[PDB]
Design a protein around this ligand. Structure first.
Ligand SMILES: [Cl-]
Ligand SMILES: [Cl-]
Ligand SMILES: [Cl-]
Ligand SMILES: [Cl-]
Ligand SMILES: [Cl-]
Ligand SMILES: [Cl-]
Ligand SMILES: [Cl-]
Length: 129
C-alpha cells in the first residue's frame, strides 16, 4: 500500500507514534517519506546481506526474521514480511522498540541525514489529525 501523507500521519497517530519518545509526528512522517516514499511494500538489500522492510525500512540484522541474514537477531519477534502489510501495526510496534534502543531516531540514518533539524511539522501541515 502506498499511503498518502496525511493518511499515514493519521495512522501513525492512531497507533501512538505521535510524540513517542519525544519525537513529534512530523519526524515519523518525514522518516517514512525518505525511507519508503510511504510504500509499505518497500524492500532494500544492504551491503552486509541484511534487508530493510516496509514504510520505515526496518532492518533484518536486528529487528525481524527473514531467514537469510546470518548471525542476525529478531528483537521485534516478527517475520520481516509482517512489515510489508497494508496494516502498519507491526512496523509501528517495532519502530517503538528501535527508537527506544538508545540513539533515538538516529537509528534511521535517513532521518538523521534528511529530517533531523528540519521543519518536520511541514510533513503534517494541513492534515486533519
Ligand atoms: Cl501500491
Ligand atoms: Cl509527500
Ligand atoms: Cl511535527
Ligand atoms: Cl536469518
Ligand atoms: Cl532474537
Ligand atoms: Cl494502518
Ligand atoms: Cl532521543
Amino acid at each position: 500500500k502506498v499511503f498518502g501523507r496525511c493518511e499515514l500521519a493519521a495512522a501513525m497517530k492512531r497507533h501512538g507514534l505521535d510524540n513517542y519518545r519525544g519525537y513529534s509526528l512530523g519526524n515519523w512522517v518525514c522518516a517514512a517519506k525518505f525511507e519508503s516514499n510511504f510504500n509499505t511494500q518497500a524492500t532494500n538489500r544492504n551491503t552486509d546481506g541484511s534487508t530493510d522492510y516496509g514504510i520505515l525500512q526496518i532492518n533484518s540484522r536486528w529487528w525481524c526474521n527473514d531467514g537469510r541474514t546470518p548471525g542476525s537477531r529478531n528483537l521485534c519477534n516478527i517475520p520481516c514480511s509482517a512489515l510489508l502489510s497494508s496494516d502498519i501495526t507491526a512496523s509501528v510496534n517495532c519502530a517503538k522498540k528501535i527508537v527506544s534502543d538508545g540513539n533515538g531516531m538516529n537509528a534511521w540514518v535517513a532521518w538523521r541525514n534528511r529530517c533531523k533539524g528540519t521543519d518536520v511539522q511541514a510533513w503534517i501541515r494541513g492534515c486533519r489529525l
